[PDB]
Amino acid sequence: EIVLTQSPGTLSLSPGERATLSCRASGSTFSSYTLAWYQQKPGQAPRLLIYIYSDGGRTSRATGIPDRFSGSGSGTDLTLTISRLEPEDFAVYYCNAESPFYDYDYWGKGTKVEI
């Protein structure tokens, strides 16, 4: 198994401020997975933001993303950084690791980012 730990648990910030979230992998971090940050605006489907290959080495942003989203780490530690909160960025943010073969898919517990 793998454990993901999102940190922080909540975030009470306000427009313009910076937000830095981080996902920690532990357990069998020496397999192949993809570590991804997803955003989930309420009432909407998750959205891939950034991701990185567990064993393969640079991060990528998804298609159609503003610059306010950045990723940094090796792939046992993704950090999503939204630099300057715009209004709609107040959402719930999740990370998962996923085997390319889908024999394992693990999700964090969530990081709520509100005002």
Numbering used by the authors: 1 to 115
Excerpt from the publication:
The results showed that L6 bound to mCD16 with a relatively high affinity, with an equilibrium dissociation constant (KD) of 54.3 ± 1.41 nM. The final refined model exhibited high stereochemical quality, with an Rwork/Rfree of 27.7%/32.6% and a RMSD of 0.2 Å for bond lengths and 0.57° for bond angles. The structure revealed that L6 adopts a typical immunoglobulin variable domain fold, comprising seven β-strands arranged in a β-sheet core, with three CDRs extending outward to form an antigen-binding surface. Notably, the electron density maps showed clear and continuous density for all three CDR loops, indicating high confidence in loop placement and conformational assignment. Unlike conventional antibodies or camelid VHHs, which often present CDRs in a staggered or turret-like configuration, L6 exhibits a distinctive hook-shaped topology in which all three CDR loops project co-planarly from the β-sandwich framework. Collectively, the global RMSD between the crystal structure and the AlphaFold3 model was 1.63 Å, with 78% of the deviation localized to the CDRs, underscoring the limitations of current predictive algorithms in modeling engineered antibody topologies.
Unlike conventional sdAbs derived from heavy chains, light-chain sdAbs represent a novel class of antibody domain that utilizes the variable region of the human light chain for antigen recognition. In summary, we established a light chain engineering approach that combines CDR3-grafting with site-directed mutagenesis of CDR1 and CDR2, providing a rational foundation for the subsequent development of VHHLs with antigen-binding ability.
